Design an enzyme around this catalytic site. Structure first.
Site, mmCIF file in Angstrom:
data_model
loop_
_atom_site.group_PDB
_atom_site.id
_atom_site.type_symbol
_atom_site.label_atom_id
_atom_site.label_comp_id
_atom_site.label_asym_id
_atom_site.label_seq_id
_atom_site.Cartn_x
_atom_site.Cartn_y
_atom_site.Cartn_z
ATOM 1 N N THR E 1 0.850 -0.931 0.000
ATOM 2 C CA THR E 1 -0.189 -0.078 -0.158
ATOM 3 C C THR E 1 0.332 1.058 0.460
ATOM 4 O O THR E 1 0.969 2.106 -1.161
ATOM 5 C CB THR E 1 -0.906 -0.135 1.578
ATOM 6 N N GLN E 2 1.156 1.571 1.413
ATOM 7 C CA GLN E 2 2.187 2.913 1.121
ATOM 8 C C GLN E 2 4.183 2.230 1.223
ATOM 9 O O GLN E 2 4.409 2.799 1.141
ATOM 10 C CB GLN E 2 1.851 3.795 2.464
#
Lengths: 220, 238, 212, 226, 216, 222, 203, 237, 237
Positions: E1-2
């Site tokens: 995701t990040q």
């Protein structure tokens, strides 16, 4: 702030200092860091005092409501679960480190609560800025299944070590001893620090402190 | 009657919900269906009225595939039946996404029955006018078959029928000896039972939609190959 | 992490007397590696309008497909196609509708208006537009634009007749400017797709350029 | 519609039907004595199959607030749960006042979610509240639609009329000590059909020390010599 | 995701006459760590479409689950149609673009291969939503090392045969293992054709170290 | 029955068959679409002389190239006309061109039934690329292209007269006189300039008021 | 800390350390990191202790409810799916390495790993935690196929002991959990019972 | 009759009455036919005219290049269905760049229209839809009734007096696969012409044609475009 | 009117809707018996299985809400399953929020509160199913409770629900009035003979399904065919 607890033979003994400081200046000399939850369980607080007080009051209210609804005594595990859920919901924004201890129908329990929501069940628990000294005192002088007076003395020694070896803690020792049938709060248990007497009459009599104007509003 | 059979939230003086008692009548009026648990699988079968020859090859089929190994044979109001089939597909997809693997048939039937009960509980929404069988097979759990009434709950069925002629089909179903017969002869026999049930005596010509699930298909509930089951239809005709 | 990356590409449009030339390179690349030698930046939207999208390739693709969807919706809602000025205005509205997180793309719309005259609308990544006789978009904008306006516009040239551009002459100048820009700008080259827009429709020619 | 409703010209017909429903059949007398308040009710379980230590008619809302009720017990459970939540919220907002009798009036006032937001169907239970954390006792009644009445002695059963008549004739009075529970039991006796026993009669007392639901031992002790 | 924790290394693939071959090694890199050596980065989208990804393996698993679920739902209707590999590539492109727009990007660079309607297709989509199709594709350092060989082969031979195509893929895998820190000597080769999708399994490439004696 | 959504037992839901017959209480309005343009004629029907004639308006210009004539509840027609203006301006802002009268009528029809249904009928008229056009929108969210339409209390008689007085190749000059003579036949009083409003549609002109009491040059011929 | 799982014929053996570190101070030297998700399914926690405990409790909730609603013991794969969903949906907020193993009649002893990120993988043996990165070579070299219960138990105990003695964030006692059809048996190795490979470097 | 008042309530005799009344909405509407072929799908709709001055209204609505529908009945909640189908098809184009198959679109329409048949205060969509589409499996013709129970059909007609058209299509449906485009369109025109009374006859202004094919995207033919098809009418009113 | 049609107070001062739901419990043709003993609590209900095409494996009316609490349902099966699901959810949620297992009395209280919310308001209706739940509780011995569609949760020692619940309650009242505690043979036999005297069929060991919770052995044992047959043989001896 230095709080500690131990599981003795018949229950739990909790100890705490009474030094609430603003930065590096002592503000309260008798700050009650041991908070009532239920007539069988108490809990010691550390960290942000206001957050700790609000959290412990909310848990105490909810658990009193739960005990009234059930009609039975509450349980330490339930209080732990409530505290853990509440703290982990905020992901540590509640800078409150707690030491939960109590006596249930299944036996005495003692738990440590961290601001991020971590919990564990331990025979002895220390928390606060001066937690290291009390933890060391326990590790040096802890014996499982140790009687009431000896447990109180051990907790007093740990609290005194935290007081005299951490500058941001102390000025009193607050104790609570709980068992299957006894709930005894001790408030100041030992005062190892006494303010010296002021030499001379360092007081100001009347006539001084010139006043520009005075207003008197009598009541009934 | 009168003021008590107006909303499902209104209980009868004797303690009955007449809205569902009337929704069952739609299932009783619509075409019949049959599902038999063979020895190593479950075989479905539904006759469908070709109300007009203007229609193409069998469409709006009473058989549906709600999951990879699970199939639904429905009867009653067909639009709400398709909506409920979509609901079952969504439930199976959600269960596969959350818990992995394949949704057990008993749990899927229980969840869809609870959803149907939720629809028949309230007042603004109305009970579903359809009854369906959920059939599936797996190596671990064998073959299962659950039937859901428009308001009732899923029940384990060795062999079940619903629709216009339930008792007439069930008599010959109980006459048939299941639990030791392979799914092939069970396909033949479900076609035979459906043709034993009246098709053109007072209605139009009927089409035979038959479904399959079992170790012979390693799960994977699919419609039986109609080209090779036309001879099963021929045996049923005889 | 950053949601933007420069993918190169060079687009160019010219408005003639009766024709609209929309040329663009097909080399898709970022950083130091080339994805492919065939990735056209021209997209036909109607029989009389072709747009060019240069810059972030993902945003180019998304914007082109949103434009297609909006054209289809407008055609259904009005029983007619969308005029070149109308699609230019609609693209401007779309670009500024996402002003605070803009499509890092440069759009140049080339086509024929209602009058049947060449129309080229250049666009800014955040929505600004203006009707122009010609414009170039992309990495090679700085090295390609001066040639085309000093030739087509006869800028800084005296004693020369401002002859309107023929289709063949405009195509030759397009090829010259693209082959000149391909070698200087590494993002430009490997092919060139040229779309000619007239009354008869859209005619596309694919020519080969420097393969490096 | 979705609130307390059905009020025609000059009437509250739905409220009047709720009041007819709360007529009930459980007397649940209450007496405000000088030392404290006694809330006594009748637990006449059908047959001996039911249990008396399982369910209770008197519920301690908080430390010194006790509660007794009337018909529609299932509604009373939700009402007492709401009252406990409201008292707990007040004690959490105004932290550590030991709020019972400076709260008894307040908790009775906050019994407006009780009826003023009826919930389509109004509650069918009238409840008596006792509290003594003010140096003085308090007895309040909240009905299916009204508000605090601040009673000194009343009943809310099938024979509540004759129960109240017995209370006034027996002179509920003002000098009566905490042991007016004898008079409360006698008032129940008038509205009781049987030989009342420790499990048949449930009573809670609220004095200045606090509230306590009397166990069957003390209930039988008081019932002895009656 | 990040910020991915377990990252899958490069994946490549080339199309030939009548089919496409892709290959991905079975290593899950926890940074510089070879934590998972027996994981499959190749998924069977359907009977005639395959997919491989490079990057966060958790994101790859999530996409695998979602895409398999949607393919199952598509095949449940029994309408005879199917998600063509072109459509699959477009759907993945839109998903990656939407995740980037929401500022929750999917740390995966994905290669989609398929063979439908008698014509081979080989798609490509990355984290930033940039998508296209090329006869030869590679991800990460594979696009730097393995891709040039594919480009030089395809420049002289626009069309390819299956045997020489898979031999070229094996040689590119050997090169990647030679000159990539995140690579591993265990790769799966998946071939899509008219007959369907077939995955060879834990294939390995032979290493050559005769140049080790050239140090002195 | 009485429910605004429940269908009738026979063929078509009620409470919208009631909404459509609200032009019956409304006043008469007639529009003619010719090759020259579109002529929109209405009656003001002033009840008292004290009320300003300019206040009572049944024809309002949606935009420079669209004119609308209402017939029914002026309150609901105000909302519909405002929505028409907003949609036209939004379309012009989005596409930098003049929104087609058919598209405007389609949008207003979409907003007509989405709240108890609006009970007004509109006669949109304007110029576009497909010459001058006129559309009749009805309270039941339905629009139809028409060349010469009548609406109002006596829509039947006015439409019947227009059916035989209209021809496919007329101009504005004949259309205005035909509409005015028909109006005079329908109404109770005469067609005084203070009682009759007229709107003209031109390919090269915006749609303005008909000469503002200098329009007697058209009613004197009547 | 270090957590480790191994799968053998008919069951699994889990080994975890009892140390949870906060900076450089030992917060809890007797931490119980083998949380029973169900009767025959156990969890090994590493990383943020609060996050691991919360995720384990929520998954215990969901798995117990699911097993009750099925009237059947849950699958280890189902539990691993629950953990992977919980960790993946909240990976940006929750940072925790979780090792899952257990026994079910459907397949038998199973072992799954769900580290930070939310990925699920089935392995013969699983290893994780801060101190795991120091015994990779030993665990890979000294692992055989078809090892019995006692062999797996001793090998896991040795691996945890060396991870403890090498990693600074690991120490205290060792907790072993043997999961099989007969049930689960949990034992604690402490003090002298710790398998020690003494390093007597010559002077 | 009490039980016929609301959609939610269920009749004691069986099926509910409001939906049965909903099917009368399509019955009270202008006739429209739609037939399949081997490669083409053609819709022939009767453009009902209010008066000779007004136009013949609009039928055979446009959805996409490969899908076109014909409405019959309540026109209010019919443009809504057209917008829904257009939006779904454009969503399909936007997500995976392929024409949305007609069967999936019809299933979506049925699911969408099923909810009002069960939600209180929501009338059923009393519109009959004759969807013509060309997916990868050749042309398709689907009929959507307000009961949300769609049907697939070789050739189906809906509208007032549509039973005669249904009978003609059924009698001539055998020779439908092997027909040229003009031949199939003339079959549809003959089917629709048999619906109206003998006084009415097919005109260029009162008919609409919607044709979709393999190489021919959906196109709405009218008067000038209909005239080549209208020739060779074989008029037997 | 509508006093007897919606959940509103009657003019006489009664609530007729729940009064009808209680009879709805009687509808369905089933009975159940719950007997608390000296150390255990057993519940038995008949298993009315029409035709053997049903699966007797899953036709049961008794379930495990948690590891120590078991319910038996009387009334409509759909509402019964819904309330069982709600009870399981409540037990799981209590175990999540509070570490210790939910007491059976608290679970009954929560279910009764949900039912009281149902009889409140007017949008929903009460569920026509009466649930009898049992479970071992420390410091309390065996515990049995009943939650009804109204919301009155009570019942102890011997309690029955179903069509012929009055006769069973009368016989159990006679038995409990006979002052002798029932061990873990006498409690089961008492329940079996109660249900047999209620419905005299001699109870072939296939038509009843008994659930047992003891103190030394926790958990809700759904005793198999062998156990019920052995108990029946011991009783009929």
């Amino acid at each position: 702030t230095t709080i500690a607890g131990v599981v003795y033979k018949d229950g739990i003994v909790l100890g705490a200092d009474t030094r609430a400081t603003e930065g590096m200046v002592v503000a309260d000399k008798n700050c009650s860091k041991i908070h009532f939850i239920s007539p069988n369980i108490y809990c010691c607080g550390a960290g942000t005092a206001a957050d700790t007080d609000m959290t412990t009051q909310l848990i105490s209210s909810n658990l009193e409501l739960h005990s009234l609804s059930t009609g039975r005594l509450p349980r330490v595990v339930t209080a732990n679960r409530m505290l853990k859920q509440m703290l982990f919901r905020y992901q540590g924004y509640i800078g409150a480190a707690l030491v939960l201890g109590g006596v249930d129908v299944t036996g005495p329990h003692l738990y440590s609560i961290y601001p991020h929501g971590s919990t564990d069940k331990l025979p002895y628990v220390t928390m606060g800025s001066g937690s290291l000294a009390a933890m060391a005192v326990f590790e040096d002088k802890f014996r499982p299944d140790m009687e009431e007076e000896e447990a109180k003395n051990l907790v007093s020694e740990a609290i005194a070590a935290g007081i005299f070896n951490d500058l941001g803690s102390g000025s009193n020792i607050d104790l609570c001893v709980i068992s299957k049938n006894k709930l005894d709060f001790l408030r100041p248990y030992t005062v190892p620090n006494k303010k010296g007497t002021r030499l001379g009459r360092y007081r100001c009599e009347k006539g001084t402190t010139a006043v520009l104007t005075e207003k008197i509003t009598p009541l009934e | 009657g009168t003021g008590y059979d107006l909303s499902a939230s209104t209980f009868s003086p004797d303690g009955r919900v007449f809205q569902v008692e009337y929704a069952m009548k739609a299932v009783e009026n619509s075409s019949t269906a049959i599902g038999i648990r063979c020895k190593d699988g479950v075989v479905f079968g539904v006759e469908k009225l070709v109300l007009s020859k203007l229609y193409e090859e069998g469409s709006n089929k009473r058989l549906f595939n709600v999951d990879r190994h699970v199939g639904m044979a429905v009867a009653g109001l067909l639009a709400d039946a398709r909506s409920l089939a979509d609901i079952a597909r969504e439930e199976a997809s959600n269960f596969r996404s959350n818990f992995g693997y394949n949704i057990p048939l008993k749990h899927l039937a229980d969840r869809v029955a609870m959803y149907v009960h939720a629809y028949t509980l309230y007042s603004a929404v109305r009970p579903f006018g359809c009854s369906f069988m959920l059939g599936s097979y797996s190596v671990n759990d064998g073959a299962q078959l659950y039937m859901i009434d428009p308001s009732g709950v899923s029940y384990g069925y060795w062999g079940c029928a619903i629709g216009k002629a339930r008792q007439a089909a069930k008599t010959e179903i109980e006459k048939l000896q299941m639990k030791e017969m392979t799914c092939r002869d069970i396909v033949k026999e479900v076609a035979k039972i459906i043709y034993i049930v009246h098709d053109e005596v007072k209605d139009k010509a009927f089409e035979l939609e038959l479904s399959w699930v079992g170790e012979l298909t390693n799960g994977r509930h699919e419609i039986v190959p109609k080209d090779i089951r036309e001879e099963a239809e021929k045996y049923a005709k005889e | 992490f950053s949601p933007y990356v420069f993918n190169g590409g060079t687009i160019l449009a010219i408005a003639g007397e009766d024709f609209a030339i929309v040329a663009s390179d097909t080399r898709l690349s970022e950083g130091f590696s080339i994805h492919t030698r065939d990735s056209p930046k021209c997209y036909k939207l109607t029989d009389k309008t072709v747009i060019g999208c240069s810059g972030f390739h993902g945003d180019c693709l998304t914007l082109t497909k949103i434009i297609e969807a909006r054209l289809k919706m407008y055609k259904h809602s009005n029983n007619k196609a969308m005029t070149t000025g109308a699609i230019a205005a609609m693209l401007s509205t779309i670009l500024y509708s996402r002003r605070f997180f803009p499509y890092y793309v440069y759009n140049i719309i080339g086509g024929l208006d209602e009058e049947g005259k060449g129309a080229v609308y250049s666009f800014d990544p955040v929505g600004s537009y203006q009707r122009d006789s010609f414009k170039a978009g992309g990495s090679a904008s700085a090295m390609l634009q001066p040639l085309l306006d000093n030739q087509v516009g006869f800028k800084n040239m005296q004693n020369v007749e401002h002859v309107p551009l023929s289709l063949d002459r405009a195509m030759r100048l397009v090829k010259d400017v693209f082959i000149s820009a391909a070698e200087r700008d590494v993002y430009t080259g490997d092919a060139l797709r040229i779309c000619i827009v007239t009354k008869e429709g859209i005619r596309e020619e694919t020519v080969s350029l420097r393969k490096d | 519609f979705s609130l307390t409703t059905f009020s025609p010209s000059g009437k509250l017909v739905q409220i009047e039907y709720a009041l007819a429903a709360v007529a009930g059949g459980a007397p649940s007398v209450g007496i405000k004595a000088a030392n404290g308040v006694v809330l006594a009710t009748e637990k006449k379980q059908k047959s001996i199959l039911y249990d008396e230590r399982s369910v209770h008619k008197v519920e301690p809302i908080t430390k010194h607030i006790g509660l007794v009720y009337s018909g529609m017990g299932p509604d009373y459970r939700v009402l007492v749960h709401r009252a406990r939540k409201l008292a707990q919220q007040y004690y959490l907002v105004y932290q550590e006042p030991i709020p019972t009798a400076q709260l008894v009036q307040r908790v009775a006032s906050v019994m407006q979610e009780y009826t003023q937001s009826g919930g389509v169907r109004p509650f069918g239970v009238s409840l008596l509240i006792c509290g003594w954390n003010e140096g003085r006792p308090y007895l309040f009644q909240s009905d299916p639609s009204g508000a605090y009445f601040a009673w000194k002695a009343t009943a809310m059963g099938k024979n509540y009329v004759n129960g109240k008549t017995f209370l006034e004739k027996r002179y509920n009075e003002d000098l009566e000590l905490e042991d007016a529970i004898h008079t409360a039991i006698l008032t129940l006796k008038e509205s009781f059909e049987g030989q009342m026993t420790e499990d048949n009669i449930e009573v809670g007392i609220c004095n200045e020390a606090g509230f306590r639901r009397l166990t069957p031992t003390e209930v039988k002790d008081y019932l002895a010599a009656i | 995701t990040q910020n991915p924790m377990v990252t899958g290394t490069s994946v490549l693939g080339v199309k030939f006459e009548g089919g496409v071959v892709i290959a991905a090694d079975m290593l899950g890199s926890y940074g510089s760590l070879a934590r998972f050596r027996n994981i499959s980065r190749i998924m069977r989208v359907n009977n005639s479409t395959m997919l491989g990804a490079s990057g966060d393996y958790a994101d790859f698993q999530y996409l695998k689950q979602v895409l398999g679920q949607m393919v199952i739902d598509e095949e449940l209707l029994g309408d005879g149609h199917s998600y063509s590999p072109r459509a699959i590539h477009s759907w993945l492109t839109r998903a990656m673009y939407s995740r980037r727009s929401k500022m929750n990007p999917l740390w995966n660079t994905m290669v989609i291969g398929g063979y439908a309607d008698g014509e081979s297709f080989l798609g490509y989509v990355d984290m930033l939503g940039v998508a296209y199709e090329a006869p030869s594709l590679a991800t990460g350092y594979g696009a730097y090392l393995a891709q040039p060989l594919l480009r030089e082969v395809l420049e002289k031979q626009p069309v390819l045969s299956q045997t020489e195509a898979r031999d070229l893929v094996e040689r590119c895998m050997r090169v990647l293992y030679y000159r990539d820190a995140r690579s591993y000597n265990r790769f799966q080769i998946a071939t899509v054709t008219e007959k369907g999708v077939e995955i060879e399994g834990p294939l390995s490439t032979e290493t050559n170290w005769d140049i080790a004696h050239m140090i002195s | 029955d009485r429910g605004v959504n429940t269908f009738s037992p026979e063929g078509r839901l009620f409470q919208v068959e009631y909404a459509i017959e609200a032009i019956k209480l409304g006043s008469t309005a007639i529009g003619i679409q010719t090759s020259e343009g579109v002529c929109l004629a209405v009656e003001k029907r002033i009840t008292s002389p004290l009320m300003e004639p300019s206040s009572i308006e049944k024809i309002v210009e949606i935009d420079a190239h669209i004119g609308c004539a209402m017939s029914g509840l002026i309150a609901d027609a105000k909302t519909l006309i405002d929505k028409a203006r907003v949609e036209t301006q939004n379309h012009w802002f989005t596409y930098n061109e003049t929104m087609t009268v058919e598209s405007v009528t389609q949008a207003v029809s979409n907003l007509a039934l989405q709240s108890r249904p609006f009970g007004v009928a509109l006669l949109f008229g304007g110029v576009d690329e497909k010459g001058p056009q006129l559309f009749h929108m009805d309270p039941s969210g339905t629009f139809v292209q028409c060349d010469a339409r009548a609406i109002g209390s006596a829509s039947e008689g006015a439409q019947s007269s227009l059916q035989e007085v209209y021809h496919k190749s007329m101009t504005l000059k004949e259309a205005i006189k035909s509409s005015l003579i028909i109006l005079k036949q329908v109404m109770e009083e005469k067609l005084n300039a203070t009682n009759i409003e007229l709107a003209t549609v031109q390919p090269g002109q915006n749609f303005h008021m008909f000469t503002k009491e200098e329009l007697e040059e058209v009613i004197k011929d009547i | 800390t270090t957590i480790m799982a191994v799968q053998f014929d008919g069951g699994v053996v889990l080994g975890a350390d009892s140390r949870t570190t906060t900076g450089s101070y030992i917060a809890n030297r007797v931490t119980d990191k083998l949380t029973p998700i169900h009767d025959r399914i156990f969890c090994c926690r590493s990383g943020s202790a609060a996050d691991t405990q919360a995720v384990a409790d929520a998954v215990t909730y969901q798995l117990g409810f699911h097993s009750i609603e099925l009237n059947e013991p849950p699958l280890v794969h189902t539990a691993a799916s629950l953990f992977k969903e919980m960790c993946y949906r909240y990976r940006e907020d929750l940072m925790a390495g979780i090792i899952i193993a257990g026994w079910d009649p459907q397949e038998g002893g199973q072992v799954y790993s769900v580290p930070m990120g939310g990925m699920m993988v089935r392995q013969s043996f699983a290893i994780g935690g801060s101190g795991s990165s120091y015994i990779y070579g030993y665990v890979d070299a000294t692992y055989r196929e078809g090892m019995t219960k006692e062999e797996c138990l001793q090998f896991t105990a040795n691996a945890l002991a060396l991870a403890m003695e090498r990693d600074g964030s690991s120490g205290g006692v060792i907790r072993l959990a043997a999961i099989a059809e007969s049930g689960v048996e949990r034992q604690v190795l402490l003090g002298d019972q710790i398998p020690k490979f003494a390093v007597a470097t010559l002077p | 009759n009490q039980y016929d008042n609301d959609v939610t309530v269920w009749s004691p005799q069986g099926r509910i009455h409001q939906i049965e009344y909903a099917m009368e909405a399509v019955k009270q509407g202008s006739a429209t036919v739609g037939l399949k072929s081997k490669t083409h799908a053609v819709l022939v709709a009767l453009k009902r005219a209010q008066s000779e001055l007004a136009a013949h209204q609009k039928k055979i609505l446009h959805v996409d290049n490969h899908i076109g529908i014909s409405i019959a009945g309540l026109t209010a909640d019919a443009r809504l269905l057209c917008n829904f189908m257009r939006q779904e098809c454009l969503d399909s184009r936007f997500v995976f760049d392929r024409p949305l198959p007609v069967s999936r679109l019809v299933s979506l329409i049925g699911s969408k229209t099923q909810i009002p048949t069960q939600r209180y205060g929501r009338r059923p969509y009393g519109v009959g839809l004759l969807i013509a589409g060309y997916d990868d499996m050749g042309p398709h013709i689907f009929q959507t009734c307000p009961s949300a129970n769609y049907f697939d059909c070789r050739a189906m007609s809906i509208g007032a007096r549509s039973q005669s058209a249904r009978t003609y299509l059924e009698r001539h449906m055998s020779e439908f696969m092997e027909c040229n485009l003009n031949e199939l369109v003339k079959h549809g025109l003959r089917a629709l012409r048999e619906t109206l009374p003998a006084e009415q006859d097919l005109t260029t202004k009162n008919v609409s044609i919607g044709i979709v094919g393999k190489d021919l995207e959906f196109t709405i033919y009218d008067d000038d475009d209909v005239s080549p098809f209208l020739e060779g009418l074989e008029e037997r009113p | 009117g509508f006093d007897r049609h919606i959940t509103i107070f009657s003019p006489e001062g009664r609530l007729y809707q729940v009064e009808y739901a209680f009879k709805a419990i009687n509808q369905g043709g089933l009975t159940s018996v719950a007997v608390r003993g000296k150390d255990c609590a057993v519940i038995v209900t008949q298993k009315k299985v029409p035709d053997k095409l049903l699966d007797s494996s899953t036709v049961t009316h008794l379930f495990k809400i948690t590891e120590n609490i078991g319910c038996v349902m009387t009334g409509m099966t759909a509402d019964s399953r819904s309330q069982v699901q709600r009870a399981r959810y409540e037990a799981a949620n209590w175990k999540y929020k509070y570490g210790y297992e939910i007491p059976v009395d608290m679970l009954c209280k929560r279910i009764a509160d949900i039912s009281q919310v149902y009889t409140q308001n007017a949008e929903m209706r009460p569920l026509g199913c009466c649930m009898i739940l049992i479970g071992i509780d420390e410091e309390q011995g065996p515990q049995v409770y009943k939650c009804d569609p109204a919301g009155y949760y009570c019942g102890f020692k011997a309690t029955a629900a179903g069509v012929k619940q009055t006769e069973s309650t009368s016989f159990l009242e006679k038995k409990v009035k006979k002052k002798f505690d029932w061990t873990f043979e006498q409690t089961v036999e008492t329940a079996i003979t109660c249900l047999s005297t209620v419905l005299s069929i001699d109870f072939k060991p296939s038509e009843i399904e008994v659930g047992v919770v003891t103190v030394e052995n926790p958990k809700f044992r759904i005793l198999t065919e062998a156990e019920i047959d052995a108990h029946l043989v011991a009783l009929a001896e």
